[PDB]
Amino acid sequence: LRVGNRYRLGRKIGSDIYLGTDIAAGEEVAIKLECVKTKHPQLHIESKIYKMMQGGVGIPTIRWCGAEGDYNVMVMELLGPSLEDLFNFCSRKFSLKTVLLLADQMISRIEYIHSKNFIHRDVKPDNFLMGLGKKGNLVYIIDFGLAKKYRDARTHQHIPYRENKNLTGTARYASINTHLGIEQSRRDDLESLGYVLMYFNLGSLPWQGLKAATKRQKYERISEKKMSTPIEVLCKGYPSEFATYLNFCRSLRFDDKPDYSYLRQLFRNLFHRQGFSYDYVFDWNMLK
């Protein structure tokens, strides 16, 4: 089918997102469709966030937005596989060098979003995608469905402290503050990334596959296990920088501006002591 004059719809690449072509440019694109009648319209919200983010390194380009018969349509830059996909392809083991390469760009992406007055609130390996082609060394961040302003765009007034807030994003990677029902802020995006980096180190987190009767009884088991696992037990056998990173995130006050620069430099100093080069040669680049 057509869309927006110059785009041809292909088959799904997940759920919804479809392969497309920009017929005029001769370039593959991704096309997100949302039925107009859908109960909870969010595409149009996601599109306005992507629009504020444009110009950002590792933010997908939104090429076209509009409605076509029964669907809202967002046409975007086509991105490669997620960090979770690549992790499965690498037998759920990343080398220390790959974790550090990823950590450097992922902290940068989060800082960029925060600089545009948003928190993501869904930091997980599935929401970072590698670029394709000339962008194949670039980590992108996607899925701004759960993102919100943490400060007024004009005054940079932070959102107020509030409690009794329900779990927003993913149980496995959520901050302890999120489990306690505290309003998410910049610190929580960075604390989740910390869990993601130790997930890549370990192959799983120690609060994965907890038996529970319900979804609720289960978030409660994950909450308890997380709060009862010291950062030095989580990070045992791995460079201290992973523990230092998480202790820093956990020490941040609700409206604190993180020292992104300090956190990046922690990992760069580790990277340099290991004698690694920033050559973007990830583990998956070695697959024959």
Binding site: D122, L167, G169, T170, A171, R172, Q208, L210, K215, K218
Partner: peptide, 8 residues
Amino acid sequence: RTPSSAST
């Protein structure tokens, strides 16, 4: 996908 790993 596991619900512990699902966006909510």
